[PDB]
Design a protein around this ligand. Structure first.
Ligand SMILES: Cc1ncc(COP(=O)(O)O)c(C=O)c1O
Ligand SMILES: Cc1ncc(COP(=O)(O)O)c(C=O)c1O
Lengths: 405, 405
């Protein structure tokens, strides 16, 4: 007879779920969904490519057996995939200097890497303020010291590049740091090239260890190689680092949990070791990755007509989004007038990625629910869920709501 | 510049991989594969059903969107699945007393449960001797005390039911115990019904907490509800427990990593809590399960023509295997004569599951490699990989090899 459940309390979850509850917990239709990590279609329902639907078909055509992955990934997976981050061709790729592995989405790659860091002398991790929430949970709940680096400027609404590089300069030495360089979650502010070179110099002097978080290649810009420039610049005049890569939004592969982990190694013989360490680590958890989601990925990425058909719809996507964001603040500059409010909404258009980040709205978050619109506690906003129909209602209620103070 | 890799040593892996290396590391064709966890076809290559190939097709027909699983499983998944272990109908199922969740294979379910046990006052875990290897690794490498209960009798070659229930009687109280009741890995010896009732009585007096490991429903017997009887008996006169369930061999879904976790709860309101705890736990790892492998499973299991077509091929499978095992020792009783050896091979036919377990062979394991046949260090033997062609060569070399002492 299980009694263990006697000491069993219930838990407060992340901001991201108290709200997920709330969206689908009331009677009203015309409910609005602006908190979800997902990207919405024109019809306000989940997105999916055709390239991906075709990769799917392609996969159940070419494959009949379903083997365990030896493996922690394929050979095509680990080359096709790393093309996307390091481009082509690379000093690193064809010299077999990258050890890459298939994980369970970006989350899945982050966590194995953290498990891999406990493996070493890694007591402390730096994260840029404010940080992707789960990073906090994932880091902390395995007893690392979590420290914060200055980043987003809360009053200017841009990165504070002065204080960011400052901390980057007086934080020990060979400190381990997590960077979101593009499509920042939640900030939605990417690092301008103006500053790459200085960083490279700081990172070289301090010999820091960098972990790049790449969840949205192709949302910050029109060209998707742009979004990953710092990495490529880093590679030239070779520095070592790590990459957690998600395709949850890239390929619209949400539930498939498609992700990768890239670790840059000194020689063809360190690659071999780290690999065994990783396989080892993976075996006290789930032993191996999903073969289906491996196949779907190789098929798409490995075929030109699909890669090119996808990249296009992808390029066509970031456009619509950054456009939708422009439109949005323009409706707020307007409705604003009805309530005689005096806010500069122009400063949130600079922003890029799946969201916009309006700290000001943190104040109005629980009042925006009396009307049937849901938004994260901190100001973050799923832009992809604002239809041509939606703008008025939303923008109005934001102002209406704002004026009650 | 990554320096961390300075303290980086390479690791000795489990017996199961030093060998996996070895199988595919030599020039000889007519190499024989008797170590692999997988089940081999007539042609000595990996198995797969037609029901499963059809579920696959079915799935890419009915589904176009790919959402995150809220969720940690579906509603169909958690009812369809638990039918298989608790039968139908159950006192537990329709009274919403089971909390079940979709995991990444059996491994994936074992580990979340262990993470769930650290969550409580669980300092010590009992395992039956000898234990599924990974259990050792998974338990220990998170700082539980691992203790062993008497089980398999090494000289008689059957369970020692006398000493097994003994320990079961003097091991603290509400001790947490892992049981493989059928298709034991490695032993290949299942618990006879003769003894179920006594156990139920012991487990009731000592209030122990049981975790059943079910990786092979349908390999121990002809009827696949048989293999899970103890569980169903346990359910009548309701006791609480847990189930880790893999479909890696059941559905031949190896790389798909299909698995489930069942926890039996006091009321419809403990279910709700444990659920939140589990979601919580899952979120410091991979956040959610694979949607594809969820869909493949529901489709098969939910459609009669496929469930029935699968169960049949399944029932047709355990037959062939236990037959293949009978044949095998009969060739060893024969070739044995050529070398004038005097071993009783009849005692290994009782055995059941994907393997046979012959401790005697542990002695001959590294000599059986000079001939091109591979076998685990402890005696375990993948029976499914012995073709009508193979018997002679294998059985001969075993005897030949045995006689060199
Ligand atoms: C910054 C960041 N890192 C990692 C992830 C993890 O993505 P996934 O759900 O595919 O693991 C996300 C969410 O997409 C994210 O926004
Ligand atoms: C006893 C036992 N438990 C758990 C597992 C884990 O199976 P999976 O690879 O699907 O996670 C296995 C292997 O099939 C096993 O033999």
């Amino acid at each position: 007879m299980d009694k263990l459940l006697s000491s069993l309390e219930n838990i407060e979850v992340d901001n991201i779920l108290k709200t997920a509850r709330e969206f689908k917990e009331d009677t009203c239709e015309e409910k609005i969904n602006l908190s979800i990590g997902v990207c919405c279609n024109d019809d306000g329902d989940l997105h999916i490519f055709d390239s991906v639907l075709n990769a799917d078909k392609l996969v159940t055509e070419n494959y009949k057996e379903k083997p365990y992955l030896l493996g922690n990934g394929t050979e095509d997976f680990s080359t096709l995939t790393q093309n996307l981050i390091f481009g082509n061709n690379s000093k690193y790729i064809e010299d077999k200097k990258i050890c890459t592995i298939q994980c369970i989405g970006g989350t899945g790659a982050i966590f194995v890497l953290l498990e891999f860091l406990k493996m070493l002398n890694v007591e402390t991790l730096y994260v840029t303020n404010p940080p992707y929430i789960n990073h906090v949970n994932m880091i902390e709940s395995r007893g690392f010291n979590l420290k914060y680096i200055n980043f987003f400027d809360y009053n200017l609404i841009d990165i504070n590049y002065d204080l960011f590089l400052n901390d980057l300069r007086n934080i020990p030495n060979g400190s381990s740091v997590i960077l979101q360089i593009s499509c920042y979650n939640p900030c939605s502010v990417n690092i301008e090239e103006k500053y790459f070179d200085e960083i490279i110099e700081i990172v070289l002097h301090k010999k820091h260890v960098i972990i790049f978080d790449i969840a949205y290649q192709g949302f910050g810009h029109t060209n998707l190689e742009e979004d990953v420039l710092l990495i490529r610049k880093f590679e030239e005049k070779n520095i070592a680092f790590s990459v957690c890569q998600s395709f949850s939004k890239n390929m619209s592969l949400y539930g498939e949990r498609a992700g990768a982990l890239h670790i840059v190694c000194k020689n063809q013989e360190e690659k071999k070791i780290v690999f065994n360490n990783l396989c080892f680590i993976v075996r006290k958890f789930y032993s191996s990755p999903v073969i289906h989601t491996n196949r779907i990925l190789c098929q798409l990425l490995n075929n030109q007509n699909l890669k090119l058909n996808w990249i296009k719809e992808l390029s066509q996507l970031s456009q619509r989004i950054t456009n939708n964001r422009i439109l949005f603040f323009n409706k707020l500059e307007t409705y604003q007038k009805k309530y005689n409010l005096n806010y500069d909404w122009n400063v949130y258009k600079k922003q890029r990625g799946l969201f916009s980040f309006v700290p000001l709205l943190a104040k109005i978050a629980e009042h925006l629910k009396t009307h049937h619109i849901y938004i994260i506690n901190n100001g973050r906003i799923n832009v992809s869920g604002i239809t041509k129909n939606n703008v008025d209602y939303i923008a109005d209620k934001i102002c209406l709501s704002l004026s009650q103070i």
